[PDB]
């Protein structure tokens, strides 16, 4: 049941994809460490809550 994934390598030694392994030891998911592979989203719901969302080059108020 081992989980394997790619590290995002920053400073590369003079030696390419490097991996790390993770295994959960506990039944309760709350006991788990943080995966930290977090997806993002649009600012839109906050930066443009508009019913008619308009194109940046056209007049804001028409």
């Amino acid at each position: 049941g081992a989980q394997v994934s790619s590290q995002k390598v920053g400073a590369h030694e003079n030696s390419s994809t490097i991996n790390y392994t993770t295994i959960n030891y506990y039944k309760d998911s709350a006991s788990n460490a943080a995966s930290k592979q977090d997806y993002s989203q649009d600012p839109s719901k906050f930066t443009e809550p508009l019913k008619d969302v308009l194109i940046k080059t056209a007049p804001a108020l028409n």
């Binding site: 049941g1 081992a2 989980q3 394997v4 994934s5 790619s6």
Partner: peptide, 4 residues
């Protein structure tokens, strides 16, 4: 295993 499970490789992503």
């Amino acid at each position: 295993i499970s490789e992503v």
